[PDB]
């Protein structure tokens, strides 16, 4: 019934020292029924990364929409979009459906190519921006993620330390949520290299 908890799944994003990290589970379901263990929720447009939780049809639709919009942006601007600018674009796009919204919980993550500043942001379904320094959480285990992130997180973590923190935050949150799990992916993002790691977790 509730569109934001039909398909399930989670996204979390964290800032570190000269780096950001964004991670998601791989589950797609029809309520109790597990349907897919390969449904990735993190996409990227150039060097800007976007995680999207919520109703899966809207996750897919919005990914296609922001690919559409960032491609035209690049052709006209003659440069790739930045995380700060993209965040405003995500907000504008969600609010234009104010009285018929996409049932999603987007999460922007990336490093500004000019300033080198790590950036993360979150949104509600309607476009309200949450620009936190520390971390952003989203999905059916957001409470669990808030609890994990609040205790595990400390500022200025190195990329390889940040990986462990966000991975453990995601994994243990997903294990306390029926509609999340079935595999996980973690992106470690630096100014000019990105490493993607698939995590091993319980498959129930």
């Amino acid at each position: 019934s509730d569109p934001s908890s039909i398909n399930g799944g989670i996204v979390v994003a964290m800032t570190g020292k000269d780096c950001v990290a964004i991670a998601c589970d791989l589950r797609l379901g029809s309520q109790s029924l597990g349907v897919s263990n390969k449904f990735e929720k993190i996409f990227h447009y150039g060097h800007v990364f976007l995680g999207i939780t919520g109703l899966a049809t809207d996750v897919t639709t919005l990914n296609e929409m922001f690919r559409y919009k960032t491609n035209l942006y690049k052709l006209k601007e003659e440069r790739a979009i930045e995380p700060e600018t993209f965040t405003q674009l995500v907000s504008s796009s969600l609010y234009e459906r104010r009285f018929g919204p996409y049932f999603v919980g987007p999460v922007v993550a990336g490093i500004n190519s000019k300033s080198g500043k790590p950036f993360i942001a979150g949104f509600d379904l309607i476009g309200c921006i949450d620009e936190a320094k520390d971390f952003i959480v989203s999905g059916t285990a957001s409470d669990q993620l808030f609890g994990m992130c609040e205790s595990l997180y400390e500022p200025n973590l190195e990329p390889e330390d940040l990986f462990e923190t966000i991975s453990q935050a995601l994994l243990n949150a997903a294990d306390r949520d029926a509609l999340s799990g079935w595999g996980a992916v973690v992106y470690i993002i630096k100014k000019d290299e990105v490493v993607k790691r698939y995590l091993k977790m319980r498959q129930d």
Partner: protein, 222 residues
């Protein structure tokens, strides 16, 4: 229409050690967006080296604790001052809760103490009396924020030993009372930051063979 139930907020946490047990709970009491009291004790010493808390609707919580304390008193009268073991107390509480199966005590009950072999024990109850011995159990408003953290830091879930890469789990080493209290305090500090109904103060009751000891700690009052 008259609604006989209410939500008084609050969060409680029971952890069973090797030869000890702790039952912690915040001292804040609320309705809706208002604070009733910054210090309203929620975890109680019920005698016979048993500690108890009934979190949720405070009136039902107080009623249940009162009735259980009364049950301990009458257990002594009827059975020659015999000590009520934690397992016997747990079964007794099931019958108190299930007695109101069709008009439940709207609470999540946790008791803590020592079993008959001297080992740490925590029992967890649902509103209608289903129960189970558990090693670790958070209850109430911020339970969803605390339990995943405890799975990770107490039971070492999803943690493996470096070098092996997912082949060898981190060994389940025993935690001391000082180590548990750190995890309790950090759990409530984190819960206070991210949950509006949690704050003001943290009161911990520690149960050992020597008796029941109390510890109080300040929490953020916003």
């Amino acid at each position: 229409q008259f609604n006989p139930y209410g939500d008084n907020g609050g969060t409680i946490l029971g952890i069973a050690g090797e030869d000890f047990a702790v039952l912690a709970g915040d001292t804040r009491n609320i309705t809706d967006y208002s604070i009733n009291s910054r210090y309203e004790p929620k975890v109680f010493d019920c005698g016979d080296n048993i500690v108890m808390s009934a979190n949720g609707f405070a009136a039902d919580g107080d009623a249940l604790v009162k009735r259980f304390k009364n049950s301990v008193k009458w257990y002594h009268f009827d059975h020659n001052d015999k000590k009520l073991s934690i397992n016997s107390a747990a079964r007794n509480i099931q019958h108190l809760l299930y007695g109101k199966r069709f008009f439940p005590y709207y609470v999540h009950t946790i008791i803590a103490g020592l079993d008959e072999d001297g080992k740490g024990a925590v029992y967890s109850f649902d509103p209608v009396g289903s129960y189970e011995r558990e090693q670790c159990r958070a209850g109430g408003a911020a339970a969803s924020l605390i339990m995943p953290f405890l799975d990770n830091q107490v039971n070492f879930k999803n943690q493996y030993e470096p070098g092996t890469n997912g082949k060898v789990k981190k060994p389940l080493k025993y935690l001391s009372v000082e180590e548990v209290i750190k995890l309790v305090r950090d759990s409530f500090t984190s819960a206070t930051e991210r949950h509006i109904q949690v704050g003001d103060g943290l009161e911990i009751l520690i149960v050992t063979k020597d008796g029941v000891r109390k510890e109080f700690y300040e929490l953020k009052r916003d």
